[PDB]
Design a binder for this molecule. Structure first.
Ligand SMILES: N[C@@H](Cc1cc(I)c(Oc2cc(I)c(O)c(I)c2)c(I)c1)C(=O)O
Ligand SMILES: N[C@@H](Cc1cc(I)c(Oc2cc(I)c(O)c(I)c2)c(I)c1)C(=O)O
Ligand SMILES: N[C@@H](Cc1cc(I)c(Oc2cc(I)c(O)c(I)c2)c(I)c1)C(=O)O
Ligand SMILES: N[C@@H](Cc1cc(I)c(Oc2cc(I)c(O)c(I)c2)c(I)c1)C(=O)O
Length: 560
């Protein structure tokens, strides 16, 4: 019995949580209460199978079981065409209501009145809004979330206790989700082989001391865990993750020095820890790379004889000695190495042909460096806000067809690269920046894929996972784009507009800025400022009240 197998390994609590998430991620619109039930029904059924492994229907597969329940066009199908359906219907941008937070005390009263339905609510909302969220990590969040309510709903200043914590959690959660989406997207759109090279590059950087054989073992298990969470097999994913978590800590020595701290803590805490671990120190006298990959005579022999291993070795070797290189950069290098061998080994004298292969990397290594240098200079200069506006303008000219909410969204996060990476030494900027940009550009890709409107986005997004950043960067202003006419509907007054926070204000102002650029593509940084200002002055004036609605309306109609 598979149900019981999992129930036994994860325990009832985690099992009930994981199953809830599984349902919330498959049916994002359904009411909270409805899901809960299904869980209860399913959780009980497992218990019986735990009792009688031979009980009725305990021989079923988790997908069949869960699917059937969910069905009480997708349902009218059968396994596995039926499950592929639910996956295929996950909405990365559901039309769900805003999930704002009530009044501190209002929540607490609920956190107390009924504590289990409270957390189930948490796991429920997050899961439905992020159908790809990493189940395990979400449990970790669930705890940290409950903690806050247990240490803040009982103290002097609570809204000054809780809130600050609730902030940091939504941010970490958003980063987590964005991170897992890249992983699922990597797998689904480019295959596991693409994901494996990627993970190989990442672990070789975090574990330079580790042996290639060890890193491979980790990547294989790691590939299995993510395929599962990405494909809905949450229960098995949580199970398999814990095994790996346990494995890593046991062989901790032959892997990384930084795992020591991680291993002492509880399951969830130590898994999150490993997931966040910093690069171990890099071994000293390491044999030059050229020796085995350029100078050797067996280069072509090994390529033919075992390309997959040989190339994996190349990635592993290069990555481990270059923590100063973004993983996508290394992947390009690996790709270049292969192309060069693909041609060279057919050539007359292979040794001469692939002899200067390191030469061809130089260009590929400098490109990311200069760019990172440039925007960090620009950042020290403009600051987060003014920086995002620079990007916002830049990217709206590249892909005008893309809707405003998304352009503002993506540009904002592209702007956070600066505050999140430039406060680092050269040696640690590229991996920070370029690998962070991969996450943000993937948000664009997945959000744009639900209703494509720009071939330029689609081409860059689908052509290669590794060239995305170069692809977007290289993009010139879309000239075929026809200016969006003026539509006052965008700025229709709304009471809330005058009583906005600094964050909310900037988003309105940035929305305005995109709408402006979309309307006058050929504007100047200067003439854009002018317009933004007059408008800013207008809104500020009209907010200084009297009859607000009239000023905005009266004076607005005048501007329009
Ligand atoms: N920028 C990437 C780099 C990165 C990728 C992987 I693959 C990885 O290995 C794990 C192991 C476990 I256990 C997890 O639960 C997770 I998530 C990732 C680690 I460490 C770092 C990221 O941080 O995603
Ligand atoms: N004033 C600078 C020009 C400059 C403007 C921007 I806006 C910028 O920021 C990005 C960030 C990303 I991410 C891209 O993909 C791209 I293209 C540009 C950078 I770096 C440089 C000079 O003259 O030196
Ligand atoms: N219709 C929206 C409300 C809304 C009104 C205005 I007027 C507006 O325009 C600006 C322009 C600048 I420049 C600012 O600094 C600010 I604040 C607002 C925007 I964007 C949105 C709703 O229904 O929610
Ligand atoms: N009189 C013109 C219409 C027009 C109205 C406005 I108000 C305006 O100014 C802004 C400012 C911001 I900020 C925006 O995001 C946008 I869109 C337009 C511009 I330029 C032109 C005609 O019909 O010929």
């Amino acid at each position: 019995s598979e149900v019981a197998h999992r129930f036994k390994d994860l325990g009832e609590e985690n099992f009930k949580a994981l199953v809830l998430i599984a349902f919330a991620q498959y049916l994002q619109q359904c009411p909270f209460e409805d899901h809960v039930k299904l869980v209860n029904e399913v959780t009980e059924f497992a218990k019986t199978c735990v009792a009688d492994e031979s009980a009725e229907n305990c021989d079923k597969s988790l997908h069949t079981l869960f699917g059937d329940k969910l069905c009480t066009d997708c349902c009218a199908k059968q396994e596995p065409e039926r499950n592929e359906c639910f996956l295929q219907h996950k909405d990365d941008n559901p039309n769900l209501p805003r999930l704002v937070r009530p009044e501190v005390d209002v929540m607490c009263t609920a956190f107390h009145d009924n504590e289990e339905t409270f957390l189930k609510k948490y796991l429920y909302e997050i899961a439905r809004r992020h159908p790809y969220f990493y189940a395990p990590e979400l449990l970790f969040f669930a705890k940290r979330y409950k903690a806050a309510f247990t240490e803040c709903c009982q103290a002097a200043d609570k809204a000054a206790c809780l809130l600050p914590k609730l902030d940091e959690l939504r941010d970490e959660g958003k980063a987590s989700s964005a991170k897992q989406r890249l992983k699922c997207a990597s797998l689904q759109k480019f295959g596991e082989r693409a994901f494996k090279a990627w993970a190989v590059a990442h672990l070789s950087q975090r574990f330079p001391k580790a042996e290639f054989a060890e890193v491979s073992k980790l990547v294989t298990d790691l590939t299995k865990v993510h395929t599962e969470c990405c494909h809905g097999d949450l229960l098995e994913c949580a199970d398999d993750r814990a095994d790996l978590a346990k494995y890593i800590c046991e062989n901790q020595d032959s892997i990384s020095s930084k795992l020591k701290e991680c291993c002492e803590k509880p399951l969830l805490e130590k898994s999150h820890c490993i997931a966040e671990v910093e690069n171990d120190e890099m071994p000293a006298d390491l044999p030059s790379l050229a020796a085995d990959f350029v100078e050797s005579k067996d280069v072509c022999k090994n390529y033919a004889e075992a390309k997959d291993v040989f190339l994996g070795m190349f990635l592993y070797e290069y990555a481990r000695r270059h923590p100063d290189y973004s993983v996508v950069l290394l992947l390009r290098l690996a790709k270049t190495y292969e192309t060069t061998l693909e041609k060279c080994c057919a050539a007359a004298d292979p040794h001469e042909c692939y002899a200067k292969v390191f030469d061809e990397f130089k260009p590929l290594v400098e490109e990311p460096q200069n760019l990172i240098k440039q925007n960090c200079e620009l950042f020290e200069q403009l600051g987060e806000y003014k920086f995002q506006n620079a990007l916002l303008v830049r990217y709206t000219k590249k892909v005008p067809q893309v809707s405003t909410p998304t352009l503002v969204e993506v540009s904002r996060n592209l702007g956070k690269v600066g505050s999140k990476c430039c406060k680092h030494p050269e040696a640690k900027r590229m991996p920070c920046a370029e690998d962070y940009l991969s996450v943000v550009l993937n948000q664009l890709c997945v959000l744009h894929e639900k209703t494509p409107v720009s071939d330029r986005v689609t081409k860059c997004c689908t052509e290669s996972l590794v060239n995305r950043r170069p692809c977007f960067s290289a993009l010139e202003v879309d000239e075929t784009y026809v200016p969006k006419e003026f539509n006052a509907e965008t700025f229709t007054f709304h009471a809330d507009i005058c009583t906005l926070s600094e964050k909310e204000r900037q988003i309105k102002k940035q929305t305005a800025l995109v709408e402006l650029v979309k309307h006058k593509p050929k504007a100047t940084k200067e003439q854009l400022k002018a317009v933004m200002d007059d408008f800013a002055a207008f809104v500020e004036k009209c907010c200084k009240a009297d009859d607000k609605e009239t000023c905005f309306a009266e004076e607005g109609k005048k501007l329009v």
